[PDB]
Write a protein that binds this ligand. Structure first.
Ligand SMILES: [Mg+2]
Ligand SMILES: [Mg+2]
Ligand SMILES: [Mg+2]
Ligand SMILES: [Mg+2]
Ligand SMILES: [Mg+2]
Ligand SMILES: [Mg+2]
Ligand SMILES: [Mg+2]
Ligand SMILES: [Mg+2]
Ligand SMILES: [Mg+2]
Ligand SMILES: [Mg+2]
Ligand SMILES: [Mg+2]
Ligand SMILES: [Mg+2]
Ligand SMILES: [Mg+2]
Ligand SMILES: [Mg+2]
Ligand SMILES: [Mg+2]
Ligand SMILES: [Mg+2]
Ligand SMILES: [Mg+2]
Ligand SMILES: [Mg+2]
Ligand SMILES: [Mg+2]
Ligand SMILES: [Mg+2]
Ligand SMILES: [Mg+2]
Ligand SMILES: [Mg+2]
Ligand SMILES: [Mg+2]
Ligand SMILES: [Mg+2]
Ligand SMILES: [Mg+2]
Ligand SMILES: [Mg+2]
Ligand SMILES: [Mg+2]
Ligand SMILES: [Mg+2]
Ligand SMILES: [Mg+2]
Ligand SMILES: [Mg+2]
Ligand SMILES: [Mg+2]
Ligand SMILES: [Mg+2]
Ligand SMILES: [Mg+2]
Ligand SMILES: [Mg+2]
Ligand SMILES: [Mg+2]
Ligand SMILES: [Mg+2]
Ligand SMILES: [Mg+2]
Ligand SMILES: [Mg+2]
Ligand SMILES: [Mg+2]
Ligand SMILES: [Mg+2]
Ligand SMILES: [Mg+2]
Ligand SMILES: [Mg+2]
Ligand SMILES: [Mg+2]
Ligand SMILES: [Mg+2]
Ligand SMILES: [Mg+2]
Ligand SMILES: [Mg+2]
Ligand SMILES: [Mg+2]
Ligand SMILES: [Mg+2]
Ligand SMILES: [Mg+2]
Ligand SMILES: [Mg+2]
Ligand SMILES: [Mg+2]
Ligand SMILES: [Mg+2]
Ligand SMILES: [Mg+2]
Ligand SMILES: [Mg+2]
Ligand SMILES: [Mg+2]
Ligand SMILES: [Mg+2]
Ligand SMILES: [Mg+2]
Lengths: 158, 134, 259
RNA sequence: CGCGACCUCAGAUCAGACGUGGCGACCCGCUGAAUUUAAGCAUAUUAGUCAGCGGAGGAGAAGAAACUAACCAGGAUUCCCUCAGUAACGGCGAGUGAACAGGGAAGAGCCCAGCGCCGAAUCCCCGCCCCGCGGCGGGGCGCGGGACAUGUGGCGUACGGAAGACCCGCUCCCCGGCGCCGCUCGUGGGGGGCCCAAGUCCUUCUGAUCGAGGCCCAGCCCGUGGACGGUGUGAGGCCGGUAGCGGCCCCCGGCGCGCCGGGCCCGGGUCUUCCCGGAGUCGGGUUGCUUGGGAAUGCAGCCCAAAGCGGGUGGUAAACUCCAUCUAAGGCUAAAUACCGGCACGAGACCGAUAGUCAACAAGUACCGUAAGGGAAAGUUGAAAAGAACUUUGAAGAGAGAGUUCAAGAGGGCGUGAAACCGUUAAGAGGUAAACGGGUGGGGUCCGCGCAGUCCGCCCGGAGGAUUCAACCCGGCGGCGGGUCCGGCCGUGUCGGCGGCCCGGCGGAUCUUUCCCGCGCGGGGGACCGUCCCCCGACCGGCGACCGGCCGCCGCCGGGCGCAUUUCCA
RNA sequence: ACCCACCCGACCCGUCUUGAAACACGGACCAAGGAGUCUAACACGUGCGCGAGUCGGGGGCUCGCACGAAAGCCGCCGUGGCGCAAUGAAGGUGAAGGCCGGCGCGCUCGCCGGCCGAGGUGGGAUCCCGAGGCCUCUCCAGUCCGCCGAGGGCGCACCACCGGCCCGUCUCGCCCGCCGCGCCGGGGAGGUGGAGCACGAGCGCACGUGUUAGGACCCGAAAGAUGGUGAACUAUGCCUGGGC
RNA sequence: CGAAAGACUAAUCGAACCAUCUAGUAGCUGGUUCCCUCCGAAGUUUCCCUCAGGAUAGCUGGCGCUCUCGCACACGCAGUUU
RNA sequence: CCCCGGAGCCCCGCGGACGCUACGCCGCGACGAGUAGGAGGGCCGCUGCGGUGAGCCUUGAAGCCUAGGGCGCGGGCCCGGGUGGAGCCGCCGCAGGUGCAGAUCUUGGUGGUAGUAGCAAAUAUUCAAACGAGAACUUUGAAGGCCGAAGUGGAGAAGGGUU
RNA sequence: CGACUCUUAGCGGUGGAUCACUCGGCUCGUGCGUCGAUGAAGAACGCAGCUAGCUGCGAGAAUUAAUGUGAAUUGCAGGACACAUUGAUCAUCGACACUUCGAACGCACUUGCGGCCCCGGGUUCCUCCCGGGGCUACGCCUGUCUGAGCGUCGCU
């Protein structure tokens, strides 16, 4: 029964909720586990960025977010076509590619081509064998860095 | 402290480990120090006590400077019986009184081949650590 | 306490009319446990009233500035010999109270060195008093791996472990902190404010970079400064018998007019 | 009335394979209540919840848009935070209740049918040889069988694809083995084994010490080890361990190099000519369940039942109309995620034997019930069994002595041993049941005395006895306080240096792209402003923030002073 | 404080009840056990930190965690929450006024320059000014220090009242605007509905009380539902035997 | 199942027994654990499928705040009376 | 018409308690019933945690018992003696499965009732001996009785499970 | 004084509270994440020199082998062993073994009845008889063999 003034309030504890309470005593143990697993994955992908692949710049949807810009899922095909990277290869050099992205405006396209161009400049493709063929960079830019890149690769700053 | 996160430091766990210990493991638990004399000679602190070592009792009632030969090792009872360490029961019969190995000192070892190789292994590890410390 | 604790029986009440007492009683059988008393918080067997749960709100989370304020407060009173002595630490013969030292002390790799240091600095008599305190705990925590108890010793704030934290380790009483990762649980143990510490010049320099002086930001904790003071002249005895104030007070009526 | 193809079907203890039951914490598919709430109750709620059935895996399920949106647009699934107790549902009552965006954890994408081209270019099983054989594989050779054109394999799947011509640039990827090299993060991966510091020093307690003082050298040793346990009490140093990028030995993994056996002649852009999509499905009607989904969110049965610039979606039914957005009716896929079952560990501000699991113990035991099922009680001699030899009374159980033990005022259900209740011993009482409150008395029990308790302490006066002073100077040390702020260090407010300003850094939506570097933007200079630091002078708060001299005062030590003094004692 | 005596007083507690010593219930005695808990949500109070902000989660970076599943830090420091703005069902709209001078006819209406800038009344702790005393060992002069202070002021918070502004709504009216002159858009006056504005008070953490949802202070139904076990008793049928 | 008594269905029958949903619900019985101190009620209101209960007023406590002046220098208020 | 490092002081403004844990200390008035209920303070009490007591403890901890000595209004507490034989407490903070006379409360134990009710269905026992520590009850012998072949006899079924 | 009753205390009983211990629980976390026709889980019955229960094992039955370890096991016996030797005793566990029911498999649940191949006694393949051994569940797939049909054809 209500007594003199207060929010006529509806709690949702009518089902058997104590049967499905989910505690968080994991979380520290979890946080570590992720972190180990993270450091392992770095070490496996030895000079490759820990991050992942490079990802496009992309505007959010809706009037609300609109003004901001994130990393997207992957670079469109037009953006790869214009940059001149064969889509099947782009995956092999650490360039995210989605193929479901349309491309409406040319301002978002040329920006994302520029991204890939810049990436290709500051990328150090190792040759397949220690014996060096084409494409593969010099042993100078190799000895001076077989270095991983900490954090997201070429980060987007709005 | 102990930092190894697979050891135990848990009364109940250590005691259970102890009392329900298997024979070969008890051998190690039932170890006893060498006399300073042997400590000098072999480069070994202590040794797993055995059926017919010569031994002094260091503490208790039977604490004394006599050197009694070991009689048997009752690993179930965590104890060793020693030559003249005994007590007359009600009806005259002598009964070998138990002494815990660690409250005893080995003056003379019973050296077999295996005991010889053990002492060679312990002395070598001791001198490796002194070389590492230096 | 376990969920099933107390309810693993199947027990119905013999209703009224049997004399007895309307409790659920163990059902059937030819044992002692039959027609007993199940479930009730009062019964043997039974079920504790409001069995304890795991999702009691164990952890407790504190505003970050407040945490810092405490840690500044503890530091500030690690000065002040009175507050250090009152917190028990035998700091009688120590040379200077915010005790800062050479930075070879990063070097040491052996307790030998670390103890010798503490004896020259006259901080050993705290460690000595730690040994003296080592005794058996009172009661049930004895049988739950809290069997021995003792004093807290000298804190030792270092800037970098170059070997130090190995050296001071077996010396009972000592806790080692990084400067860059200070902790109020250790600087104010018991929630009690004083505590004799021992600084390393590298670390003791770094404090102002960590906490920021009054006219400079932290420069290491993004957006932070010291907490400002509410009153500046703390010694009110210096205030109250000033010229300025005693000039302006009526003369103290102090006769005692008894009945 | 034969023999032979195939088709559809049988039978074999035919050859060789698989499936069956279990477990069930987590997971997938069905099925599905009612207590309950609504202060009654029927819709609602409880709840797609319990019980029921089915099937799994180390996870499962989901998943590469017939998606979101309506933006300047995002771009598989899962998970968290948020959205949000919101939009919505609801006897619009009780109550119930999502999604997108946004930020994270993770991150990975693919394959068919079809349409087409390629002598079925494909697959399975036989049998002979060489290797390899405890996850039946490679290579070769057989007019040795069969599957297959009612369609196997290569190319290829919407992100387009194929075939053609010339623009370009050049040719490593995989597996079956056989070796060999570096033992490859808790700082030598995983498993096993066996190892590694320092007192039983003195004295002294103690039944026993592990306890308490002590141990000239700077402090008994060791200390990368003072976790824990054990050992006749409390142990860094007695023992096991503990610490350590410590050791050795096994085995196994994982990755590096060499050789062999095979396979494998595997691109890209540019222009032309062709090629292109899953039907009793979508969709509609419907009835029933379901959903926040409301003129139908999703799933169903039944009836109708399609199209190809089609189809689906675009959260209010319909018609017209533009836009946007996917491409359904076939399939595979690690990861972040779950885990009251299992194996193996670690920990605790938990419980400490009526608690904590039913269960510390020969517990799912005994015991009960025809059966489904129900389901207890119960830990502790002692350091050591040293568990009471022997004598004696008794048929014996039981005693009495003796002995063991530090103790049996620890005697085998024995640590401690409360209360109820009982026996006795001592004291006291007693016809209104006892017991009680208040108030005295009497007696007991002990406790404090006193064999004067006249209790102490100051100061004084007298009377005895005894050491060195005090007072004073002198020499030394230490302390305080002071102003002349005297001299110097110290710091507040102000002014002067524009002096740190570039030899002072950060911050800024201040400016400049006259600059530099990298691609109008990023980074760095360069101006500018705000903030923080050097130089000296002046004024002032001269501040407990200190030094140095001088002064005054105090105290201590030693010098002086020998006695009308200054002490001690009675 | 043990016992006994005597005088006076004196019914057995718990509980429900207008009323219990009750011929009202519970209670032979002792031991141990035994009932307002925890989570979530709200509100108010209080304490602390920061303050037009605040915030910490969730995530991440720092360690093998001995103490650590802590502690620290983060252009994540703010995605986001709450807060800093309302009001309307909604499309939407959205908290300023005054004064002065000029120009439109000052038309209590429309447009252009200057100044002030959150209105005013009453009461308001408190500050501020202060005539004037009141003396000083003498007659006057006379700066310094108070004590009081009649009288007069600025007036916090808060309260009451009157003005004003914003949104909804009505009534009455007259003008402005332009890429689109329109069933376009904008304003004015006067009422009246709003959980509004009128120089901000919140955010986070902690404790307390209260109120709820949960087993929800502890014990208690008759019932209801799902899935299983029993016809060894007994009820009836049948088969095969026995008995009078 | 009943030659019918609601009989019998393992000492249980006007719906057996076992386990679970289940700690089912209870406006109703019962109980509800230490001391001192200070304040101290109500059984009346209106509404209720309300009359053995709630709601709402009332009566209680707690926390306060804002002012007042015995610091020779007071305004307001009342279970009165004039 | 002079200075307290000296007026000698009932007031002393030069410096200030024996007193001043300022959550302290002190003075004046007034008042004090209390269920339900509310609030405050508890150097009241229980168990565990961080601090802290150079705490206590085999030269005797906890518990237990006490016609011993005291304190407190009280919750309670402290000492003496006994018993016991290994751990335990004070202070400052934090935490809670924290205080019992009742619940026809739960589990265990113990009384009064009480040496009481009771050991009465179915006719029946007696003598001697043996064994034996011991005989109303065993065994043997003798006598007297009953079941009276629809049996208190002689054999099975089911059920028991070594009787 | 007498007995009895009441009260207090001493000592003794009864009883098992309290306190102190704890090879057990309860909770939180970590890693791994493995059963079965090659017979699972579960049940049964067995097995020790003296052993009933718990445990441990399977007719090789408180265990065999192997490897590691290096003198015990022990309630009492007895023994072994040369503990200068594959070597006691534990641990590991890779080889071996694993009675009967049970998905449970020749068919039945009596522990009853069988069939079919081979072997030893029995014969001198004489079938009997006895003993041993190996097969003999259902479903399903790929093949194989034998077939069936006024199913669709062809040739004769
Ligand atoms: Mg990432
Ligand atoms: Mg329990
Ligand atoms: Mg205790
Ligand atoms: Mg299965
Ligand atoms: Mg209802
Ligand atoms: Mg109800
Ligand atoms: Mg009803
Ligand atoms: Mg529902
Ligand atoms: Mg279920
Ligand atoms: Mg899957
Ligand atoms: Mg799909
Ligand atoms: Mg999405
Ligand atoms: Mg919200
Ligand atoms: Mg629902
Ligand atoms: Mg094809
Ligand atoms: Mg130790
Ligand atoms: Mg010990
Ligand atoms: Mg050692
Ligand atoms: Mg529904
Ligand atoms: Mg619409
Ligand atoms: Mg799938
Ligand atoms: Mg027990
Ligand atoms: Mg017990
Ligand atoms: Mg128990
Ligand atoms: Mg006990
Ligand atoms: Mg006992
Ligand atoms: Mg006991
Ligand atoms: Mg004793
Ligand atoms: Mg005893
Ligand atoms: Mg006893
Ligand atoms: Mg004991
Ligand atoms: Mg008497
Ligand atoms: Mg009533
Ligand atoms: Mg009545
Ligand atoms: Mg009464
Ligand atoms: Mg009456
Ligand atoms: Mg009643
Ligand atoms: Mg009664
Ligand atoms: Mg109790
Ligand atoms: Mg508040
Ligand atoms: Mg309220
Ligand atoms: Mg509640
Ligand atoms: Mg109930
Ligand atoms: Mg019903
Ligand atoms: Mg019924
Ligand atoms: Mg209840
Ligand atoms: Mg009622
Ligand atoms: Mg009051
Ligand atoms: Mg009172
Ligand atoms: Mg009360
Ligand atoms: Mg003991
Ligand atoms: Mg607790
Ligand atoms: Mg009681
Ligand atoms: Mg009688
Ligand atoms: Mg017979
Ligand atoms: Mg007595
Ligand atoms: Mg017991």
């Amino acid at each position: 029964a209500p007594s003199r003034n207060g929010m006529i309030l509806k709690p949702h504890f009518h089902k058997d909720w104590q049967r499905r309470v989910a505690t968080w005593f994991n979380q520290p143990a979890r946080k570590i586990r992720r972190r180990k697993a993270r450091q392992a994955r770095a070490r496996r992908i030895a000079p490759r960025p820990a991050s992942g692949p490079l990802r496009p710049i992309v505007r959010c949807p809706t009037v609300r977010y609109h003004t901001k810009v994130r990393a997207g899922r992957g670079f469109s095909l037009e953006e790869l076509r214009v940059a001149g990277i064969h889509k099947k290869v782009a995956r092999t050099i650490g360039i995210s590619v989605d193929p479901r992205r349309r491309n409406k405006s040319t301002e978002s396209l040329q920006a994302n081509v520029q991204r890939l161009k810049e990436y290709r400049s500051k990328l150090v493709l190792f040759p397949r064998k220690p014996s060096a063929p084409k494409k593969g960079d010099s042993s100078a830019e190799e000895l001076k860095l077989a270095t991983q890149l900490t954090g997201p690769v070429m980060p987007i700053r709005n | 402290m102990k930092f190894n996160p697979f050891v135990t430091s848990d009364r109940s766990k250590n005691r259970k480990r102890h009392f329900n210990a298997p024979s070969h493991i008890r051998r190690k638990i039932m170890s006893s120090p060498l006399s300073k004399e042997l400590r000098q000679k072999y480069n070994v602190r202590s040794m797993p006590i055995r059926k017919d070592d010569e031994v002094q009792v260091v503490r208790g009632h039977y604490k004394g400077q006599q050197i009694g030969k070991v009689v048997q090792v009752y690993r179930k009872k965590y104890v060793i019986y020693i030559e003249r360490v005994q007590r007359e029961k009600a009806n005259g019969t002598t009964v070998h009184v138990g002494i815990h190995p660690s409250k005893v000192v080995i003056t003379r070892l019973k050296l077999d081949k295996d005991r010889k190789k053990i002492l060679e292994r312990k002395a070598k590890s001791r001198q490796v650590g002194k070389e590492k410390g230096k | 306490v376990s969920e099933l604790a107390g309810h693993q029986t199947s027990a119905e009440s013999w209703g009224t009319g049997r004399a007895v007492a309307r409790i659920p009683r163990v059902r059937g059988g030819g044992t002692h446990r039959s027609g007993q008393g199940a479930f009730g918080n009062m019964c043997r067997g039974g079920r504790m009233f409001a069995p304890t749960k795991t999702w009691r709100r164990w952890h407790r989370r504190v505003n970050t500035t407040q945490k810092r304020y405490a840690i500044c407060s503890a530091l500030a009173a690690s000065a002040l010999p009175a507050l250090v002595m009152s917190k028990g630490h035998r700091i009688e013969e120590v040379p200077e109270l915010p005790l800062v030292v050479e930075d070879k002390v990063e070097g040491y790799k052996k307790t030998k060195e670390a103890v010798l240091l503490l004896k020259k600095l006259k901080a050993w008599n705290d460690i000595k008093k730690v040994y003296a305190s080592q005794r058996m705990r009172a009661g049930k925590g004895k049988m739950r791996n809290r069997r021995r108890i003792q004093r807290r010793g000298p804190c030792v704030i270092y800037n970098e472990d170059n070997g130090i934290v190995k050296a001071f380790r077996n010396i009972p009483g000592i806790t080692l902190l990084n400067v860059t990762k200070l902790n109020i649980l250790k600087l104010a143990p018991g929630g009690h404010v004083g505590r004799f510490c021992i600084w390393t010049e590298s670390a003791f320099r770094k404090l102002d970079d960590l906490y920021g002086t009054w006219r400079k930001a932290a420069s290491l904790k993004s957006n932070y400064n010291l907490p400002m003071h509410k009153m500046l002249n703390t010694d009110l005895s210096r205030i109250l018998k000033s010229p300025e104030i005693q000039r302006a007070l009526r003369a103290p009526r102090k006769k005692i007019h008894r009945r």
